[PDB]
Structure formats: C-alpha cells, structure tokens
Design a protein around this ligand. Structure first.
Ligand code: NAG
Ligand code: NAG
Ligand code: NAG
Ligand code: NAG
Ligand code: NAG
Ligand code: NAG
Ligand code: NAG
Ligand code: NAG
Ligand code: NAG
Ligand code: NAG
Ligand code: CA
Ligand code: CA
Ligand code: CA
Ligand code: CA
Ligand code: CA
Ligand code: CA
Ligand code: CA
Ligand code: CA
Lengths: 98, 572, 280, 98, 280, 572
C-alpha cells in the first residue's frame, strides 16, 4: 500500500462530464491512498459501539477517509463556441488524512 | 507661402567635391506679392531631435532654393559626428529649412550618409538613377495661385554621371511638365470640393529601362462653405408626453457643410451652437447637444468628403406631470455663414386614472408571497421618468391578507398574499379594498375598487415537505409537494432539454411564468425561499453560467438549490 | 547603464546636481533653464533608462519624462534589448501562467449591467499583470501562433479577450487616441518603445532595426493593456493584420499623418516578417 | 434525513471495549448525519473520472465523509483495582463536513 | 465588610494612614510602633477580611498577615460563612468538573523516576485549582459520601489521590509540620480557617460553632492542596477518622500539645457530626 | 516555681455578690526557699487575644492563691464588654496570672459567662455540682520537692448551696488526698524514668449520686541520663572496596539515651557530633551523619520512652581506585555525659583485569545494531561509582564490523554489529580485535583478545519487508520477515495472554530477551527503528498504560508501532 497524498492527471475538459464542450487540457490534482496509521482512540471506541448496535441507526464513519484540506482557486478555459469559462475549486492543493 | 512637402530626402557619400548640387526646394505662395526666401537651420540635427554640430558644409541659394555642397567631406568629419549621436548608429541626419519647426512654416531635409564612396556609373541600377527611396507626397492648398512644386533631376547623379540620357514624362489635368526643363507646375487654381486626390505616374526612361513611379498630390482645404440645410427643413416638431426622463432626445435635425477644416480638436471652438434666451423654463429643462459625422458625396464621378452636424434637443430634468405648455425654441449655428434653427415643443400633461373595478380571485390553499394580479395606470409601459406608488386601504380593517409592492420596471403594483391566517378564516371570504395610486413629485392621486373572493377547499400540509419548491430534485417529488411562492399550493415542474449548458434547464418552481424568468422582481426579493434560482448570491456546483446581476443564467441538466446555505447544484 | 532610480539616488548624494534638477523640475512642470540644462547634461540622470517589469517602474518613468524638453516619433526609455491549442495547453499545465490566465479571464468576463459589458480598468490591469510577469516562452506562443483555418485564427484573436479590452462602442480618431495615450506615462513609454523596435527601414534585409525580431515582438506585446491596445482585425488565417481600435475618419487636414500612423500597424513589413518568422 | 453534527451518549467505560475494567460513566460526543449540500465541482469531476476507469485503481473518496475537526483533551477515571486512567481524545468537540 | 485589597486602595487615597501603614510594615517586617498601632486601629485596614476563591487572594492574605502582632488558635481572615460512584458520574457528566478532574488526575499520576513517585507541587496546585473553582455540590458529594462496604470506602479514600499528595516517605512531627504550614501564607490562613468553623463546644446541641455544618465542611475542604493535607486513614466503612500525615512521636515534653492538636482531626465531634449529617 | 496546669476554668453568672470565692491556684516549686507569689494581669482578655477592659472585678489572695470577686456584676457591665469583642459573640473571657504569657512562667484563667442568673440548688444536676466541664490535666516536673497541686471544692457552689453534703475520694501511689481538707498532695519526689503517666479516678458523692471522673497526671523530664552504649560496642569496622559512590553508608552504630528533653527543635543544638581531626583525607572523604529515633522500654511493667541516636559514617566524594589506605576515626558525642566513638575503615584498591580470550560468533544474515556478547571487568555488578569505558582496536584495520557502547548500568560493554557490508565479505571472515578497558579518573587500563568468526550462508531480503520488526501485526507476518535489530536476520514473535491490560502483551521484537524488556539500553537508543516498544516518545492508541521514562509498560492485546510517526496501536 501507498500513503495518501497528491496525485496528478492531465485531462480534457470534455472528459470531466460537467457539460462544457471544449478541447483544452487541464491539470487535475486529487487525493489518493489509504490511511492505516491515523486511527485514534475515538475510532476504536465508535467502532466497538457500532459493533454492539448501541447507536441510533444512523450513518456514522469509523474509518478516516482521506479528503483534501484546501483547493485551488480558478481554472479558466475556452470552448468550441469562443466563450470563456471559469471553474472554481476543481483540484486539490493539500491532502490530509482527516 | 508654404512648402509643397514637409520632408526632403538626399543620399550622401564620402569625398563629395565642393560645388556639388544636392537638391531643389519649392515653396508655393498665397498672394501675388511674395518671394520665397530660404534660410537654413544652424544645427546638423541627428536622431530623435539631437544637435550634433553647426552647419558648415551644406549651403543654400535663396533665389532658386538650391541646397548644395560648400565644403568637402572625409572619414574624420563623420567619425566626429557619429561619436556625438549618444549611443545611436549614425544613419540619417537632417537640417531645418525656414522660409520667412512644423509645416507650413518650416520643412526638415533628411540626409542618409553611406560609409562607402561614390559608386561607378555602370554600377548603378536605373531604379537608383531616377527617383529616391522615399517617394514624395505633395501638399497644395486650394484656391491659391499655382506655381512650381517639383523637379525631376537627381543633381549629384547628373553631376557625376553626365553621359546617360535620362528622360522623364507624365501621363484636362491641371498639372504640366515643362518642355526642356523638368520642373512640374500647375495650370489653374484648385478646389478640393471638386476633386481632392490626384494620383499620377512619373515615368523615367534610361538609355535602357522604363520605370513607373506613383505620384500622389493631395489638395488641402479652406473654410469656403457656409452651412446648408439638407432639403429646406428648418423646423422640427416633437411632443413631450410620456417619457419625461432626465435625458431623452426630443428632436433632431441635420446641418450639411462641405467644409472640413474645423477638425475634431477645434470643432468645439468654431462650430458654435447657442440656444437663444427668452424663457428660463426652456434653459432649465432643455439643452442643445451637437455632434458631427463625416460623409462622402460625389462631385464629378469621384468621392469627396464633407461634414454632417446633428443638432438635437435633450431634456435636462424629470418633468412633472402638471406641465401643460407649448413653446418654440431658436438655436443659432455659427460657422466661424450663420444659420438659424427652430423647434416646436409641446409638453402635454398626463391623466392617471384607473379602471373602476378590479375583480379577481385566489385559492384557499395558497401560501405567503403568491402573485395574483397587477394594478396599473392605463398607459402602463409608456412611463419612463415618473414615480407612481400604489397602496391598499382595507374597509373592514379586520381581514388584512393582501399586499402591494411597486415594480418600477413597468411602474405597476403586484397583488400578493401576505397573511395566510386571515385567508383561511371563513369570516373573511369576500374582501373589499380601495387601491390608491399615488405620485411622488406632485400629490395627485387616483383610486379604484378591489373586490377579491377567496375560493376553494383546504388540504393540510405534509410534515415531510421543505419550505421551498427548489429543494426538490425530481418531477415526482416536485409535483406532489408545495413550497412558498405557489399560487395554488403545489409546485410546478418545468422540463428543459438535453442540449448541454442552456437557458432551458429543468427545475421545480412556484410559478413557471415568474420564477425561472431571469428577473428578480420586488416580490421574489422579499424573503429568499421563494425563488432562489433567480435571486441568489452564492455558488453553483456543476457546469453552469452565472446570472448577470445574480441567479442562474444557464445550467447543465437539473438545477436544485439550497437557499439556507446559498448554494445550487446543476447536474444531469 | 544606470537606471533612473539609482541615478536619482546618486543625484540625492550631492547638492548642486539636486538643486539644478529641482530647479528644472519647477521650471518645466531664458537664463535659468539653460543653466540647469547645461549642468544636467553631464549628470547620471542624463542618458538614464528604465527596464521591463522592474521594481517601481512608474517612478523610473516619472523621473524620465520630467526632463524631456518639448514629435511623431519619440526616444524609447528602455534597455536596448493546432498550435494555439497546444500553447493554451502549455500555459494550463504551468502553475504561474495558469493562475494569471485564470485571473485575467475571470476579471475580463464579468458582465455588470446590460449597458456595461465589463469592468475596463481591472481588465487592462490584469492583462498588464499577465504580460509583465510570465516568461516570454508562454505569452508569445499563445499570441503569435500560425494558423491554417478559421477556428485557429478565432482562438488566436480571442486571446486578449477583445470584446472587453479591445473593442468599444465607437471608433475614435487615431490622433485623438494618440493624444489620450500620450497624456499617460506608461502608455506613452510603451508607444515610444513600439516606435523604436518595429519601424520599417530599407537598409536591412529583414526591414527591422538591426535585424532583431525579439525586440519587435517584445515592443508589440508591451502595449496590450493600455488605451492603444492592438489586436487582430478578423479571423483570417494567412493575412496577419494588426491595428488599434481607431480609424482615419474625422481627421480634417491631417489625413496623411493619421494614415502614416496607422500604416505602422496595418502595413508594417518588419512586424509582419517578425510574426511570420516566429510562426516558422 | 438530518444534517451532520454532534450527538451525545452516556456509556460505561467497560462498554467501550478498550480493555479497562471500570464502572464509571463517561459522556461521549460523536459526529453523525449525512452530507448532501456540501459536494463541490472536485467531487463531480473525480466521480466522473472514476466512472470511466481513468484512475490507477486505488482507494479514492468521491463522497464527503463527516469527521470531527477537533477533539476533547482528557477523560480520567478509576477502576476496580483503584488505579486511575487517563484517555486522550476520546470524544469530539466540533463536527464539520470535511 | 470591605476586603483588604479595597482597604489598601482606600488607604492609598490618603497620606497619613499610608505613612503609618508603611511605618508599621517597616518596623515589623516603643513609641513609634504604638503610635502607628493607635492610628491603624481606626483604619479600614483594621477588621478587613478576605474571601474564598477571590481575585488576587494571595495579595489580600499578604495585606492581612503583615499587621498581625505576635498562639495555638488564630483568627480566621475570611468572610464568616453506591453514592461515591454516582458522585463521580455527576462530575464526569459535567464539562467543568470533568476537565478539572482530568487535570488533577493526569498531573498527580505521572511517575517520573523509580524514587520520585510524582511531581508534588503541581499535584498540590492542581488539587487547589479543583477545590477552588468547582461548585460545592460536586466537590463535596465526591469527598463526603456515606458508604457501607470496602469498595465504596476505598473509592472515597482514593479521591484526593493519597499516594502522591497525602503520603510521603516518613511521618513528621505534627508540631514541626504545623511550623512548616505556619511559615506559608496560604496554608496558615486555611489552617486558621479550619480552627474557626470546626472547633468543639459543649454549649450547642451539635458541638459546632453556631450550628453551621456548611462552614465546617468548607473549612475542611480548603486544606486539601497544602502541607497540612487531611485524608482518611483507612478503608473502614463506618469509622470516619481524618488526620494529617503526622504523628505524635519525637515530641519531647510537648506530647500533650501535639495530641491536643491531633484530636481536632481524629476525635472532633463537630467534624464527625458534620460529615455524618451530610451523609444523611 | 511552675503552675501545675496551664488553663484554669470557672463559670460566671449575673449578680454574683462581692466576696464570693471563685477558685484556688497552685504553684509547685523547685527549691526549698521559694514562696509562690501571684499577680494578676491588668486586662480582661476576650477572644483571640483581644483586650476588652482593665481588671476591676476579680481580686486575688497571694498567700493561698485565691481568685475571688471584689465587685458585683450587672447586665450593663457585660453589654459594655460584648460591644468591644469586635464582631464576636462573648462566650469566654480570660485573665493572665503571673507568679514572679506561656507555661511555666504564666497561666491564663478562663471564665465562661452566662446570660442567666444563678440557678436554684434543686435545679442543678450533681454532674454540674462536682467537677467543671473542662477536665484538668496536671504537670509535675520530675526530681522536684512535692507539694499541693489540686483542690476539689467548687467554691461558688458551696458558697451558694452550703447545705448539700458533697464528698470527694481517690482510689503505693505517691499521691494523697488529705483528710478533712480536700487538697491533693504528693508524698515523695517523682521520676519519669520509672513511670510517666498516672491515670486516677476522682469520685464525687452527692447526698444521692456517685460520679467518677478521670484524673490525668503527666510527669515531665529533665536531662538526667548520660548516653549509653547498647551492649559494650564502641567500635565499628567496615571495608570500602567496591562501592565508592558519592554518598554510601559505610558504618553505623547506636547510642542509647533515656533523656528526651532535647527535643527535635533543639536536638541539633545539644546532641553534638564532632569528627576529631588529624588527617585531611578523612575530613574531605568522610562525614558523620546523625539522627535520633524514639523507642519504648519497660521499667516496672509499664512503657516509658527513650531516644536511640544512630550515628553513621558516610562518604563525601567518588573515591579513586588507586587508594590503598586504612585508618581509625574518632567521633565525639556531647549530651549537653560525654561519649567517644571509633571507626575502623579500610579502603582497598581494585584490580580491573579481564579474561584472556573472548571467543564468540555471529551469523552472516544479521543486520545493523544486533547484540552479540558482553565485555565486562570480572567484578561486574559490584561497581557503583566508577566510570569504566571500553573501546576496540582492529589489528587488520580493513574490516571494521563491530562496535562497543558502554552500558553504565552494569558498567559493561555491548558488542553490536555496526557495518553490514564488511560482514558479508568473504575476505573478512575471522576478525581479531584488542578490547581495551579504560578508566576516567585514573588512566589505568587493561586489554584482552577478541576473536570472532563470521559464520553462515546468505539469503537475500524481500522488497516487501519494512525496516522494523514492530510494523508487523500478526505472527505469520512477523516470523516470515526480518527487521533491524535481529541477531539472526528474522524477527521473533512473543505471545502474551488474554488477561486485559498486562505487562505480557503479544508483540514482534528483534530479540525477546532485549526488546520487550522494559529498559531502553545504549544499543536500542541509537536509532529508533530497532525497538520502538521500549524507547518511543509518542502516543499509544488503545487501552494501555505508559512506560515510566518512555515506552509501552502495558497494552491490551497485540501492540504494533510506527516509529516514523511516533505512534503505537494496542488492540486485540
Ligand atoms: C457616422 O456615420 C457612419 C456611417 O456608417 C456610422 O457608421 C457611424 O456610427 C456614425 N457615427 C456617429 C458618431 O454618428
Ligand atoms: C391644458 O390647457 C388647455 C388650454 O385651454 C386646456 O384646454 C386643457 O384642458 C389643459 N389640459 C388639461 C389636462 O386640463
Ligand atoms: C461667430 O463667431 C465669431 C467668433 O466668436 C464672432 O465674431 C461672430 O460674431 C459670430 N457670429 C455671430 C452671428 O454671432
Ligand atoms: C429622474 O427619474 C429617474 C427615473 O425614475 C430616476 O431614476 C432619477 O433618480 C430621477 N432624478 C431626479 C433628480 O429626480
Ligand atoms: C406584510 O405583513 C407584515 C406583517 O405585519 C408587514 O410588516 C408588512 O408590511 C406587510 N407587507 C405589505 C406590503 O403590506
Ligand atoms: C523509628 O523506629 C520506628 C520503629 O518501628 C520505625 O517505624 C521508623 O521508621 C523509625 N524512623 C527512623 C527515622 O528511623
Ligand atoms: C596495598 O599496600 C600493601 C602494603 O604492603 C601491599 O602489600 C599491597 O600489595 C597493596 N595493594 C596492591 C593492589 O598493590
Ligand atoms: C558540650 O557542649 C557544651 C556547650 O557547648 C560545652 O560547654 C562542653 O564543653 C561540651 N563538652 C565537651 C566535652 O566538649
Ligand atoms: C560520582 O559517581 C557517580 C556514579 O557514576 C556519578 O554519577 C557522579 O557524577 C560522580 N560525581 C563526581 C563529582 O565525580
Ligand atoms: C559505527 O559506524 C559509524 C559509521 O562510520 C561510525 O560513525 C560510528 O562511530 C560507529 N560506532 C561505533 C560504536 O564504533
Ligand atoms: Ca475651394
Ligand atoms: Ca464650413
Ligand atoms: Ca472647404
Ligand atoms: Ca423571477
Ligand atoms: Ca528523673
Ligand atoms: Ca540525655
Ligand atoms: Ca530524663
Ligand atoms: Ca530493551
């Protein structure tokens, strides 16, 4: 396994499935990996309380999912109809196991 | 007196002997009493207005206007000059020539220096034997006594290669090339208003090559045209009835002028528009706005250009409704020959009466902020600069249910349900209101009757419904539940299409004629739960295009909105 | 060569040169002015220059134009220095060009009212920030990229976003637009820089001063972001025609000077050879 | 559904399954709920890139899981052998949809 | 009654009373001292008190003990004011008592070396912080909770964590421990406060001064955190015996005074009636 | 002269007449020339040393020592006193009584005042007719001429109820109650060293009730005992050979004293221990430490208490090894009767030689920081205050593989593999080292031979293995892979039990004799990858109990550790 962090990719804008009909290429930084050495006592306690069905049958999270902390500001591009478009917060800058 | 050109050209070399003529100059005159003197400037200027050394080599003949060489040259005298050029390569020097530095009072003469010596007579192509590299362009003022403005012979070429037979030739034209002397003169005086440009071809014949060179002459103008009406129209009549805004174009008329000379810098100072006095109401409510534009007119199969001055009469303040006047206004036009203009103006008052009876209904299942009908003074969409607010006056003073806001776009009032408790009571089932149409500047008003019947059954609301229609996402969860702005108690689902990011996006709205419209009127901007997809100040997640003041202008697929967080989602 | 800010600092180290400089500055902005001039001709303030994208450029240009004695051409106060889709890809894959590109696009594409298309001043300021502090292998590759059809030429015309910064409601006179630009300090200096590296000459084989294409492209790209902003007139593939947003109408008896001003953009052989050679 | 936030519970220490043999009661504040109105453009883009199998077959997270931001400091207690124990960061103080 | 800090401030508003106060302070720490005393008997500094858990308590107690003229009992300078498992539950379900409880437990249970069991001073400071600023329906319910077996009495003895703060390597003499406590300023004031609300008297039916159990429990709980720290001697359910960590051995000819000091803890009828009545 | 008690007691009432006797006082004497005078204090003191008013009511007879009433009382005179009490309720006043305020030079007499009048003779219970509420406790110095110290009759009771027949009675005792006069005297002089406490019972007979009251008498001491040996032992011999630390108890001897009077405040000033001079090495290396302790001895079937002074002789600095001396020391003991003590001391030097040959081996599959063997000077675990470091000296100077750190716990050196590259070479297969045992204070040293043979095959390592043994979690992933500190190349799995949070927790360690031991020695503290579960400074997640300097002292289930993040997990 590999620790969670930034990974990069180069994609067309039309491959993102947002509906923009463009052909430019954007850089896409996501967070990926698996957290193993970030569990705490809260995690073990909440997991053991789920195992006894003590909870009120809701959606709780007893494994730390790896999400970004901050995001990039703006990505601008042009399309097939000569019309600029600005997308706010498309890719990540900081990956943390929160 | 004025020079026929502005920039003269000549090539220099190394070790050119004294007494070698460089060029002629030409100064066309204005009156039959003038002899063109020619004085040189006392500085051999260099690059970008830089003095190098006092003129000590090139002398002048004032009578024929001849620039020639008084002294000789060597490499030391040009390395003396190229040091003083302040970091620039010595490529072209120039002198100033006065005559009694800008055109027409002065003309600067360039000189390109070559490091090589004078080339052999057989080493020169005929293109460099006939005409210089910079082709001339001549300037003749119209209505002036004609003279001589050009000469063909390259003087150092025939001074240093005198055995080559070189001839020059031109093609009802007013110009002529003199026989046995290669000066070029003009026969009769010119006018721009008949023709402004003369393109000719100078033909040089060597031994043997025939070379053609373009020859432009541009005729310059004086102010020889008084202004003229287009066709007899001296008056313009207009009626000020409905608009009354701060700046509205009331009347407009053209003035034709063949004169061009007062150009855009000095056109303000010369073409003078004076509104004649007599009444302070005109000068406090009207002003005379003026601007020119150039057009092209034909004279003899060519295209000359002339000016067309538009004079218009513009309001200065919001006129009141109580004005019942009519006047005639006089405008003076001065072409510094004088012109007079007339304007008939008629400011008519406006009656603001209403229909006698407004009969309309409302469902009992309706909610707060639901639009029912419009109150409007009869000439609805013709008011521009008039504030007209509407109010309500309940006669029973017990059953306050409806309310009126004044949409100033059409200047009309919107009837909306304000209180849900009084609408569900079986006692307040036939409501009688007295709608009052007011005015802000003057206290004139009108009034009308509003009978409204509250009709229907009543069904209780589900506890699993949200407070807005836009929170629902699908069709079945939209049409089976109600929101806030609905006029009948249920929400309406409009379906778009699959054409990508378009203005026709499928959504759940209270009213499909009011909510996904693109305008956030006075009802929807009260509390933001009614229609967030026309009024929000937030962010849209997905492929979108934002509204121009606010809202969602275009979205991809279905668009739902959470107004409690100021967020929308557009997604298929 | 010492720039004019350090020249002002070395002028501040003495009393006589500073006194004559303040004397000529109070006279401009007989026997006193000529004495101040014949002192300041040997000063380090004389023949000082500025640089492109330097620290405190506007103060250097205020030092320069305060000792200019006053005219069609003026001396430049500077140091004597699908392809378009791939250029946009190479700018988006960077991290500086991407941020500044998205800055000027998101500023210049913000419609305010149905009458005002965009905020003009912040659009021009964002264009100046993009074409100052991005390396010139990114700003030139997007702006001068040779095309063979209509879509490439339209993407190339749409680069400086002409519907906000280039166009207007009306086409002014080129002489009045030149007077507006020469009232300013930065626009006048960039115009004089364009009138030094892109003139036409019959001596060189490439029609450019000292055969320097790089100086002509650098002088052209330094005007984007001002009142005299050039762009392409149409989406033609081969015909490379640049001009400002002006025309020769309403000139008066200055039609020849106005057309001679406009031919330095429309029919300049040095600039067309420079753009076509960067295309090669 | 209910938005994600703090929920409270009162549990014996021996019910946490940590191994402590005590009988005192502690207060347990966890995070619970479901995030619906917190998705961003990054989430849609990464989900559409997963749907085309463009990724390098790793563990990525395309739904925002609701985790605590900060935790409480210390909970101390006593056991059946008269021996105090201090547990660090057992319960949450701030719930956020990160 | 005006406390001694505000009394010092009102003394600072005049010159004569402040001069006599500084005179007596320089004399202590004939005809001058008696004059300063007969001035300061009418001062607001005379008969000033302090409070429990007030702002800047140590400065008030430094103002008090600097005008005391010097002895077994001393005047108190203060304002004249399974059950144990359930008490621990009621402290853990709070948010102030939980934080301060975990503070003093995590400080007092930190073993440093095989010779040093704990850090003594920070343990006593954390105990003082817990028994100052927690409301007295939580600190008394844990400390005085009636028991009927051994586990309850052991949890009740283990409350102030006696293996760190109460015990030591040796049992000192009670007179020498009293001298150590009377050298301090806070410990002497809390000891004099205990010797005012928990004495034994034959007049009242409850053997307490003015039949105030609350004042006796408040005077007892104010000593935990000092050198004269009382706790329970054993895990006996019914026999409620408190004492400090001292003994009467090595006394000399002061055995009677030392036993009379220790009987105010071991065989005090007022304190035992107060603890048993709070148990009811 | 000294008072038999310190605090006297008496009850007051309202309107008690003049000439009413309150009480007697008693002053036992010291010499047969003394007559006890009795002067009263001039202030009626109140609560907590507060003056109220000058004594103007209670007078005294100096001869018999009689406190009686000179004047009368009323409610005005007591409301005069209760105002001056400074916010305190008037409960008990007291006087001071001098005799020629603390015991024995002074005695304060309390007076409890009642707001009621004097109660009737039939209204008084006999318990309040015989003895006061505060029972007395009497003080008699030993070896003093005996006299009268107590009297029974409550004087206002028989003054105001004289018709009640009240008798008093006591039970080889030195005390006696006189017939027909209720004074209590002592027959012969006392000594504490035979018996110290006398509890008696005073019996009061009224008309009719018989009441018994305890009657304590405590005999006080003088310094009448010179110090004494326990049984003849005046010398103590001890040998300083191996310890040599800064403060070690060399010799110790007891001194018995029946005297108690120099108590713990003044025992430093009186029981004086002086180390007699003669040699500066003794006074710079030794000191005489002294402390007492009280024991209980029997005299005649009772228990009296006496002092036992322990005198011990303690080192003062780290002695060097090169000391070869012996001495006798003299200590003077002064009981301010004089005692002399002797100490035979013998400081023997230490030889620090080593075994001649160290023969040991090492596997070829081993890793860096793997413990092999110990070098140790022969008397290993007996050195206390001596620094002995060990080094290596390779003879070939090409094959540096091993290293030595000095564990100062046993003062022994540990052989550990430092370089893995030189160990795998087939050229450096038989290594010869010269181990040198040094010393810090003196430059004395020793040396020995170290032959080590590097034996085994070699198997390459898996790329899927971590750098530490503790990263593995189960048994199969522990025993099928290697770590860093292993001596054979593979890790060792130790299994605990299911007893909750215990010291026996199952883990994966390099060496089960060194890593999960509870001590972080000098090898393991070099680089923290070797054994994190004995050396970490971090946090443990799960039910645990922390190590006392550092480490994991107890854990629940399996405990693995990530040392790159300083974290451990204990979990079943
Ligand atoms: C002037 O006339 C031309 C004719 O086409 C027109 O395009 C232009 O907008 C006019 N300008 C003004 C200011 O009216
Ligand atoms: C305006 O004035 C004319 C003048 O007679 C009058 O006939 C007309 O009624 C007036 N307009 C109104 C609205 O009264
Ligand atoms: C037109 O303007 C000129 C210059 O101001 C002035 O002399 C002349 O009188 C004006 N014409 C009229 C009719 O006022
Ligand atoms: C004139 O009328 C317009 C249109 O309503 C209004 O916006 C403006 O404020 C008015 N100005 C004045 C000065 O009344
Ligand atoms: C609607 O009702 C509210 C509640 O009294 C009132 O404040 C508001 O002014 C009303 N709106 C109108 C347009 O009358
Ligand atoms: C004194 O002797 C007693 C006898 O049991 C012992 O408990 C105590 O520790 C001794 N104290 C010292 C200081 O030796
Ligand atoms: C110490 O001194 C004695 C005195 O003769 C000697 O016999 C003995 O060998 C000495 N010790 C050592 C280790 O040399
Ligand atoms: C014992 O101490 C006393 C007091 O210092 C002194 O007078 C006496 O001489 C001492 N005894 C000896 C033997 O020195
Ligand atoms: C004395 O020896 C001990 C034991 O090694 C050591 O810790 C201490 O530092 C030494 N002190 C001096 C002064 O050498
Ligand atoms: C182990 O080898 C390293 C590498 O040269 C060296 O720095 C270190 O001192 C050696 N350790 C010992 C105990 O010799
Ligand atoms: Ca004409
Ligand atoms: Ca004209
Ligand atoms: Ca004209
Ligand atoms: Ca709308
Ligand atoms: Ca005796
Ligand atoms: Ca003695
Ligand atoms: Ca004795
Ligand atoms: Ca170890």
């Amino acid at each position: 396994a590999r620790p969670c962090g930034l990974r990069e990719l180069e994609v067309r804008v039309s491959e993102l499935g947002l509906g923009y009909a463009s052909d430019e290429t954007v850089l896409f930084r996501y967070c990926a990996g698996a957290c193993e050495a970030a569990a705490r006592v809260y995690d073990l306690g909440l997991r053991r309380l789920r195992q006894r069905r003590r909870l009120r049958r809701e959606r709780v999270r007893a494994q730390p999912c790896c999400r970004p902390t901050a995001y990039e500001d703006e990505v601008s591009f042009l399309d097939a109809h000569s019309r600029y478009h600005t997308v706010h917060e498309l890719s990540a800058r900081e990956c943390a196991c929160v | 007196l004025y020079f026929s050109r502005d920039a003269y050209w000549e090539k220099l070399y190394v070790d050119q002997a004294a007494g070698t003529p460089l060029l002629y100059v030409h100064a066309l005159r204005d009156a039959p009493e003038e002899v063109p003197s020619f004085r040189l400037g006392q500085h051999l200027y260099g690059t970008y207005r830089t003095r190098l050394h006092e003129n000590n080599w090139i002398c002048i003949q004032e009578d024929t206007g001849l620039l020639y060489l008084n002294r000789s040259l060597d490499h030391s005298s040009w390395e003396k000059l190229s040091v003083r050029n302040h970091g620039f390569p010595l490529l072209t020097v120039y002198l100033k020539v006065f005559l009694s530095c800008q055109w027409p009072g002065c003309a600067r003469v360039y000189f390109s220096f070559f490091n090589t010596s004078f080339p052999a007579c057989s080493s020169l192509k005929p293109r460099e034997l006939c005409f210089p590299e910079t082709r001339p362009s001549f300037r003749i003022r119209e209505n002036r006594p004609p003279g001589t403005f050009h000469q063909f012979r390259l003087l150092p070429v025939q001074f240093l290669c005198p055995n080559i037979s070189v001839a020059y030739r031109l093609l009802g034209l007013p110009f002529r090339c003199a026989p046995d002397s290669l000066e070029v003169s003009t026969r009769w005086a010119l006018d721009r208003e008949q023709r402004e440009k003369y393109e000719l071809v100078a033909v040089c014949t060597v031994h043997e090559e025939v070379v053609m060179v373009p020859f432009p002459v541009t005729v310059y103008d004086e102010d020889d045209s008084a202004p003229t009406f287009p066709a007899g129209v001296d008056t313009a009549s207009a009626v000020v009835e409905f608009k009354r805004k701060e700046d509205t174009v009331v009347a407009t008329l053209r003035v034709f002028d063949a004169d061009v000379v007062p150009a855009s810098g000095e056109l303000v100072r010369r073409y003078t528009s004076t509104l004649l006095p007599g009444d302070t109401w005109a000068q406090q409510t009207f002003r005379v706005e003026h601007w020119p534009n150039e057009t092209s007119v034909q004279a003899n199969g060519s295209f000359v250009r002339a000016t067309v001055h538009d004079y218009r009469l513009v309001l200065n303040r919001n006129l009141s409704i109580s004005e019942n006047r009519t006047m005639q206004l006089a405008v003076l036009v001065n072409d510094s020959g004088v012109l007079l203009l007339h304007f008939n103006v008629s400011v008519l008052p406006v009656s603001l009466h209403l229909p006698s009876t407004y009969s309309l209904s409302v469902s009992r299942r309706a909610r707060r902020f639901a639009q029912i009908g419009k109150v409007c003074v009869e000439n609805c969409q013709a008011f521009s600069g008039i504030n007209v607010q509407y109010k309500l006056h309940s006669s029973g003073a017990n059953c306050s249910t409806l309310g009126v806001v004044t949409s100033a776009e059409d200047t009309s009032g919107i009837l909306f349900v304000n209180d849900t408790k009084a609408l569900r009571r079986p006692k307040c089932a036939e409501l009688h209101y007295m709608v009052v149409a007011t005015d802000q500047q003057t206290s004139r008003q009108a009034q009308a009757q509003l009978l409204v019947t509250v009709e229907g059954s009543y069904v209780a609301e589900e506890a699993g419904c949200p407070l807005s229609c836009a929170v629902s996402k699908r069709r079945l969860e939209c049409e089976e539940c109600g929101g806030l702005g609905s006029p009948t108690g249920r929400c309406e689902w409009r379906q778009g299409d699959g054409k990508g990011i378009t203005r026709n996006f499928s959504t759940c709205s209270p009213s499909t004629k009011t909510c996904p419209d693109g305008h956030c009127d006075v009802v929807e901007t009260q509390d933001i739960n009614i229609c967030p997809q026309d009024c929000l100040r937030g962010s849209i997640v997905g492929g979108h295009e934002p509204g121009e003041p606010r809202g969602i202008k275009a979205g991809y697929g279905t668009c739902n909105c959470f107004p409690e967080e100021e967020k929308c989602f557009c997604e298929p | 060569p010492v720039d004019c800010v350090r020249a002002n600092e070395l002028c501040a180290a003495e009393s006589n040169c500073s006194s004559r400089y303040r004397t000529l500055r109070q006279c401009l902005a007989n026997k006193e002015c000529q004495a101040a001039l014949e002192v300041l001709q040997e000063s380090p303030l004389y023949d000082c220059r500025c640089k492109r994208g330097m620290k405190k450029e506007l103060q250097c240009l205020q030092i320069y134009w305060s000792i200019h004695l006053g005219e069609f051409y003026e001396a430049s106060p500077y140091e004597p220095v699908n392809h378009c889709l791939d250029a946009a890809k190479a700018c988006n894959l960077n991290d500086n060009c991407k941020k500044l590109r998205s800055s000027y696009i998101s500023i210049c594409n913000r419609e305010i009212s149905p009458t005002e298309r965009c905020n003009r001043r912040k659009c021009h300021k964002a264009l100046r920030q993009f074409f100052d502090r991005v390396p010139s292998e990114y700003t030139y590759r997007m702006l001068f990229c040779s095309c063979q059809d209509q879509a490439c030429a339209e993407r190339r015309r749409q680069t400086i976003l002409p519907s906000c910064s280039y166009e207007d409601k009306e086409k002014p006179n080129c002489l009045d637009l030149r007077g507006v630009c020469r009232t300013d300090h930065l626009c006048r200096s960039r115009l004089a820089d364009f009138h030094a590296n892109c003139r036409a000459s019959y001596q060189t084989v490439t029609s450019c001063p000292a055969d320097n294409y790089q100086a002509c492209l650098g002088s052209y790209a330094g005007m984007i972001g001002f009142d005299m902003t050039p762009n392409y007139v149409d989406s033609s593939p081969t015909g490379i025609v640049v001009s400002p947003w002006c025309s020769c109408r309403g000139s008066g008896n200055m039609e020849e000077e106005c057309e001679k001003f406009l031919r330095d953009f429309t029919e300049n052989p040095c600039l067309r050879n420079a753009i076509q050679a960067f295309g090669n």
